[PDB]
């Protein structure tokens, strides 16, 4: 049930960014963290990804935890940050982003696993929460149904793909990217991997869920109000859980289409991901410490 | 493991159609079958339906055996007939055919089971055999994976939804109609309903299939050496299966895409109901002694 939060800065561009005083400290492993001062506020995440690293940097830390799944766990990988800072980028560039190493990491994974008389069946569903109102990207009523038993969260009428080969991988892979580049901004995409897998020897029958989310623009209709309402709410969620005595404290997961949501894979035995991108242009270092702020406090 | 065929006469129309040489004896339930006469030519199907009889009626007969699946059995439903014969309106007519009746029958059984410990999982798939090449109606590779163990089959990268609430129920049966009414002549649509249902109570996992299959115009690219193969097909299929000693016969389920495909819903303990649409006008007495003369054989 651990949290982790990583900074991620990346290269400046050609539209705007310049220097750079968000100076990042090396990765001190003896603690285990990694500060980074901005100019001077001080922040310390979980690790920090510097423009220099790439995804399969990122992705390389953070496919420990995403194996876990195929342990019956589930996880959350959020990419949170004022927009144009990379979220989607962390995710879904191609065959780099997360959810495209996520399948990949977990598909070979299981190939070796099925060898080890286990086998896994996948499905997945990519959805989206626009104004707390739940949208099917892979396609009426979409409302989060929990089941207090088995821990599971369906989605009312959510279309749920079975990834079986990797032809559909590329599909969806390929839809959901052109879906959140260039609305994708001020909402939140989010793509879940059900990892059901029985094994005739053991029978041990597995399950776990992985909710990649792509949060909406933190930058500073009214889907404003909305959105700092999602945002902020997931703060004070993830902050909650990641308090010591908060197996007796009162989380707020309905406060908020979202958390409630996922509620279940981000308690009990779950595993949690903030992603705080960032970039490094001077000309947004004031709603870069905002969220570094966010991420800052949130992880306590 | 039983098959019953049935003709269906409908009503006349204003495109076409005069009088009638059709004449449909009376049901004797004491032979239990039903006899008829083309002129003059005799035929005795598991029961006739008359232009009169209505898809309430001809669903009340069917409803029996459908309600099986939810006994793991597995069903096949045939509409075979010349077109405009009435296939797909005895399948699809809105709230009537028979896929909005199994959907309704099967929905209020399970609700009704429910109350008995039981509790169902409801999936279905809709795609179509056109030119032995499956397509998804629902939504690359879509190969039949049959699973020798569960006697289950697959179809990859097709879409499976999950019939949830009656609202997508409604879409997917609209979108279905909308289909195959006025391409939808020439090929074999078929709608399965997977019921999964466990039950804490006394455990028994239970699964059934529905295949309910909307066969291409039977009337006389080259899709048509195709489609009168794959009719052909089913037809020594069919026969083959309804025969004494088939059990040790040897069926040729793969000599065909369809037949292939449902071989499950085809055998052991598996309900198949042909059911041949004719047209009372006199103007198709020629493709209609085909048609009646494609059942009355296949029924032996
Ligand atoms: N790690 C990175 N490496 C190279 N370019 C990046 C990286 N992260 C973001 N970008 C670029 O920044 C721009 C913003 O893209 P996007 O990921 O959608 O940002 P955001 O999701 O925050 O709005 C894109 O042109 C993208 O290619
Ligand atoms: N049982 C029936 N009652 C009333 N009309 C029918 C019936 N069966 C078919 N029809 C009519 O015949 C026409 C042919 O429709 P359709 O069912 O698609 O036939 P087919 O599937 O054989 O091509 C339609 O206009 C339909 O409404
Ligand atoms: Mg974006
Ligand atoms: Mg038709």
Not at 33 to 55: A, R
Not at 85 to 112: E, Q, Y
């Amino acid at each position: 049930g651990n949290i982790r939060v990583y900074c991620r800065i990346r290269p400046a561009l050609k539209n705007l960014e310049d220097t750079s005083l968000i100076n990042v400290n090396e990765f001190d492993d003896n603690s285990g963290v990694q500060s980074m001062e901005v100019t001077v506020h001080e922040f310390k995440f979980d690790k920090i990804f510097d423009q220099q690293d790439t995804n399969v940097d990122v992705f390389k830390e953070v496919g420990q935890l995403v194996q876990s799944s195929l342990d019956g766990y589930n996880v959350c990988i959020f990419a949170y940050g004022q927009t144009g800072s990379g979220k989607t980028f962390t995710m879904l560039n191609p065959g780099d982003g997360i959810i495209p190493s996520t399948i990949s990491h977990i598909f070979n994974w299981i190939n070796k696993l099925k060898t080890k008389g286990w086998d896994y069946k996948v499905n997945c569903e990519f959805i989206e929460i626009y104004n707390e109102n739940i949208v099917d990207l892979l396609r009426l009523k979409h409302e989060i149904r929990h089941d207090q038993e088995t821990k599971t969260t369906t989605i009312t009428n959510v279309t749920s793909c079975k990834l079986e080969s990797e032809e559909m991988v590329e599909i969806i892979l390929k839809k959901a990217n052109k879906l959140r580049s260039t609305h994708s901004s001020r909402s939140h995409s989010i793509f879940i991997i059900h990892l059901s897998g029985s094994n005739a020897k053991t029978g041990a029958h597995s399950y776990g869920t992985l909710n990649l989310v792509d949060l909406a623009g933190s930058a500073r209709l009214r889907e404003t109000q909305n959105i700092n309402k999602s945002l902020s709410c997931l703060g004070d969620v993830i902050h909650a859980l990641g308090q010591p005595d908060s197996t007796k404290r009162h989380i707020p997961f309905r406060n908020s289409k979202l958390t409630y949501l996922l509620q279940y894979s981000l308690t009990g035995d779950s595993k949690t991901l903030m992603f705080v991108n960032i970039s490094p242009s001077s000309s947004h270092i004031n709603e870069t410490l905002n969220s570094l702020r966010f991420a800052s406090k949130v992880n306590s």
